[PDB]
Ligand binder design. Structure first.
Ligand SMILES: O=C1C[C@@H](c2ccc(C[C@H](NS(=O)(=O)c3cccc(F)c3)c3nc(CCCc4ccccc4)c[nH]3)cc2)S(=O)(=O)N1
Length: 297
């Protein structure tokens, strides 16, 4: 994998490889997303879920939410990629997390980035001010949080007011991944990823983990592409067999625009190559990543 990486660097062809992916990427209808009554449920007019893979809310009224089920068959993992909820779709977001039985939510953006709103404040920041989503009959409470230098882990209690059943939902928030950019290093990205893996949130005993950034395609796609490729290297008999471009194209059959820049693609290569070290046995790379990620700053 590092041989191809190496030859792409030297050829200086990241942009070309990336454009080829854009050109070969699937293109399926998004009719429900584009219905006029669904307009205020989309943060960006040009980022929509494909009809075939969209997540349907269980409410009789309007079952629409800008979310997509990305089902990677060989790797055996599923993810839900969605936009940062809007003020009117926060109830919808937690309704999907409830109905889909998700256990963890991976947020890769900040509510405000460079002076622009990118996502609504859909979870409570204070223990004492829980949130109620009237339209969906759900209550959400912040139970605790572990704040690190570049990410935070939050324990949330989601409750179905109707049945009074409650669930523990884990929030994994990467606070330093710039829009249209990349993590500070493979180390802090992988550090974050394995923290999600180790929590149990990605276990097939739970519903799909819900991943999102602002549009649910650039940073979200980068996160999922690396996790899936690492899963494959640990599955197949020959880890060097993983073709990241093919995997990216497979992912794009489920949601449009996954990976938004040639550099995010190159970063994905670095994250996987680096992460392969741990998949092959190296027992010192994980701690090395933590140190390099300066999480205890
Ligand atoms: O790294 C990232 C990029 C963010 C991001 C990506 C895309 C958008 C959508 C945005 N729409 S508009 O209405 O502001 C907008 C801007 C320019 C032209 C236009 F008509 C509408 C956007 N779209 C493009 C270009 C198109 C990007 C794209 C490519 C394939 C599939 C889907 C979207 C660039 N920014 C917003 C944030 S993320 O939160 O997904 N993480």
């Amino acid at each position: 994998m590092e041989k191809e990486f190496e030859q792409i660097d030297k050829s200086g062809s990241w942009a070309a490889i990336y454009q080829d992916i854009r050109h070969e990427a699937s293109d399926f209808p998004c009719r429900v997303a584009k219905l006029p009554k669904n307009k205020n449920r989309n943060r960006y007019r040009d980022v929509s879920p494909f009809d075939h893979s969209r997540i349907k809310l269980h409410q009789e009224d309007n079952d629409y939410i800008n979310a997509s089920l990305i089902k990677m068959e060989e790797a055996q993992r599923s993810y839900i990629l969605t936009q940062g909820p809007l003020p009117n779709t926060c109830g919808h977001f937690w309704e999907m997390v409830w109905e889909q039985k998700s256990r963890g939510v991976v947020m890769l953006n900040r509510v405000m980035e460079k002076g622009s709103l990118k996502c609504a404040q859909y979870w409570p920041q204070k223990e004492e001010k829980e949130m109620i989503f009237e339209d969906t009959n759900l209550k959400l409470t912040l139970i605790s949080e572990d704040i690190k230098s570049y990410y935070t882990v939050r324990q949330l209690e989601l409750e179905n007011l109707t049945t009074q059943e409650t669930r523990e939902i884990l929030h994994f928030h990467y606070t330093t991944w710039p829009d249209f950019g990349v993590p500070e290093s493979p180390a802090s990205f992988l550090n974050f990823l394995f923290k999600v893996r180790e929590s149990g949130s990605l276990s097939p005993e739970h519903g799909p983990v819900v991943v999102h950034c602002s549009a649910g395609i650039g940073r979200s796609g980068t996160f999922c592409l690396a996790d899936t490729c690492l899963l494959l290297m640990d599955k197949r008999k020959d880890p060097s067999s993983v073709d990241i471009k093919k995997v990216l194209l497979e992912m794009r059959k489920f949601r449009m625009g996954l990976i938004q820049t040639a550099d995010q693609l190159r970063f994905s290569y670095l994250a996987v190559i680096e992460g392969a070290k741990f998949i092959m046995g190296d027992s010192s790379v994980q701690d090395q990543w933590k140190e390099l990620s300066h999480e205890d700053l």
